Design a protein around this ligand. Structure first.
Ligand SMILES: *[C@@H]1O[C@H](CO)[C@@H](O[C@@H]2O[C@H](CO)[C@@H](O)[C@H](O)[C@H]2NC(C)=O)[C@H](O)[C@H]1NC(C)=O
Ligand SMILES: *[C@@H]1O[C@H](CO)[C@@H](O)[C@H](O)[C@H]1NC(C)=O
Lengths: 49, 75
C-alpha cells in the first residue's frame, strides 16, 4: 500500500443581519439605516457553515 | 375576500409602540388584523415616530359599515 497524504483548509460561513422588527423576524436589505437615537436595535448572527 | 386572507398578529404595530424603522415593502394582499394591537388600524393621523416606524400612515375617512362591499380609500 502506497499512501498519498494530502491536506487543505476551509472557511466556514457565518453572518449577521439587522432584524427590522422586535422578536427578530425580518432582515434588513438596505445598505444604510438612518434612525433615531431613542429607537432600539435588533440584530442577530446566523451560521450557514 | 373575507375567507381568503393572511392574519397579522404583531403586537408592535400598535399606535402606542415607541419607535423603530420597519417598512412594509413586502406586504401583498388582503390581511386580517388580530392581536393585542386590536382589530382595526388607524383612523386619524397618529403623531410622528410611532408604531415602530419613523413615518407611519393611517386611513383617512371612516371604516365602512357592515354590508358595504369593496371600498376605495387612500391611506
Ligand atoms: C386591492 O384592490 C385592487 C382593486 O381590485 C387590486 O387590484 C389592483 O387594481 C388596480 C386598479 O385596477 C391595479 O392598478 C393594480 O395593479 C391591481 N393590483 C395588483 C397587485 O394586481 C389589488 O391587487 C388589491 N391589493 C391588495 C394589496 O390586495
Ligand atoms: C383624507 O381625509 C381627510 C379627513 O377628512 C381629509 O382632510 C383629506 O383631504 C383626505 N385626503 C384625500 C386625498 O382626499
Amino acid at each position: 500500500a502506497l499512501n498519498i497524504r494530502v491536506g487543505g483548509t476551509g472557511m466556514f460561513t457565518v453572518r449577521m443581519a439587522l432584524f427590522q422588527t422586535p422578536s427578530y423576524t425580518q432582515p434588513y436589505q438596505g445598505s444604510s439605516v438612518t434612525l433615531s437615537t431613542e429607537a432600539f436595535l435588533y440584530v442577530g448572527t446566523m451560521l450557514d457553515g | 375576500p373575507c375567507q381568503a386572507h393572511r392574519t397579522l398578529d404583531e403586537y408592535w404595530r400598535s399606535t402606542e409602540y415607541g419607535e423603530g424603522y420597519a417598512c412594509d415593502t413586502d406586504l401583498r394582499g388582503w390581511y386580517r388584523f388580530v392581536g393585542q394591537g386590536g382589530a382595526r388600524m388607524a383612523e386619524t393621523c397618529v403623531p410622528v415616530l410611532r408604531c415602530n416606524t419613523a413615518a407611519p400612515m393611517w386611513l383617512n375617512g371612516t371604516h365602512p359599515s357592515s354590508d358595504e362591499g369593496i371600498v376605495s380609500r387612500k391611506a
